[PDB]
Amino acid sequence: GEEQMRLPSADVYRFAEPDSEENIIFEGIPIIKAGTVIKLIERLTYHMYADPNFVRTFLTTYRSFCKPQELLSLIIERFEIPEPEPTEADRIAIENGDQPLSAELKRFRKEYIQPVQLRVLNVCRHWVEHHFYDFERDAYLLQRMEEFIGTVRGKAMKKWVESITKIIQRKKIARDTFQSSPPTVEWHISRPGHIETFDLLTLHPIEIARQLTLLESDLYRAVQPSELVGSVWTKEDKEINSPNLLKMIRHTTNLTLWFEKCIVETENLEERVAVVSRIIEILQVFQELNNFNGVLEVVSAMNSSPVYRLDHTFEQIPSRQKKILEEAHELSEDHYKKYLAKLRSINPPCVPFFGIYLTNILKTEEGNPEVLKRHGKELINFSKRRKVAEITGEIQQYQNQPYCLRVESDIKRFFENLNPMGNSMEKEFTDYLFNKSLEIEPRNPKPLPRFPKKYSYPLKSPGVRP
């Protein structure tokens, strides 16, 4: 019909092929369910309207179906739209040295070329503003973007080229607060600066949780939604695609295993009761700070194979501390029903529990197909990417919640450099912790032997009241 004749031919432009059941599926603006990468780029830079939601979702999730170099090539190809040939009358006009009417050419420029070219520049602007890490990880991608942006000519393009350049430079420079004062830093046995004596029972339980909450808050806030899409932290190139997420996972593994190591490596029953009691006090302070990540690291350590089975140790734990620890576990029951009600009812600041997002993203990634097939053609399942993007959107709503707590660099460095496993692998280390648990509290028919004390200093806790 007339509509497709106005548009460029498929032999000169790939983004003008009409929609059909084998290139795009839908669920004022229609929501895209699936499509070829060409149809996704086309609707990303559609001429009829802007789509901020689809631009946001696409730039968070595109790396799961398209490489950054390929996306740049596609939006440049999209921008280079062929203009129609002059009509027969205008060909005669031009050949006579006269100005053509160019009515359709001007219409196509105003109603199609200009909107698409401005929509391509808007993708470029959102790309550098919210995903500049793609350009830091690939210097050549930035050379190509700056060459493209630097050669764009036009009246309406001028403002866009300058705002994209302002964002690029502002991001390059970024490479190189409190309304009230924070509480007084707490000390217990270990003195400020005597890092050689820093340990679970020597540092104040309040300050251990405060400094871990700052460290975990910082770790939580550095994770970018794209580190979670396509399960890329589980794939082979995980170290480049998911550096902040892997730091968050390694911290949680190291802290949880450190709590287990402190517990099972304390062979004396009375001393081990004090260690467990101190970790529950650390959890109580994580509850006061709304650090749900920390609360569930402690629950994870208490529910581990080596610790959960220590019946003689939990027998001596006061009922008040037992009920605190049992309620913290109930945050995880019924698919984290209680955790989610708590998270939505608290006031900021908080550190949400990170593991539940990883779990739900893996369930979405494993339970939805990468493509949808229609008439023998493969279409990228975009609604799969949108569901993962919605979950990572839940992460973001809590990434602007700084804590009014003073950093203590020595305690911060102690928790950053925790290495409970040492040179052992995780599986072999957890086998060791469980074999140590059987040593300190043997199975029922075998009796309970006594063990010598290892702590010279006192075991009494200073408490959780500041």
Ligand SMILES: COc1cc2nc(C)nc(N[C@H](C)c3cccc(C(F)(F)F)c3)c2cc1OC
């Ligand atoms: C069905 O499996 C479980 C049910 C649980 N139910 C509750 C109420 N809490 C649990 N765990 C908490 C963190 C806990 C851990 C150690 C010791 C105590 C204390 F002795 F203090 F009570 C409490 C549970 C753990 C489970 O499996 C590992």
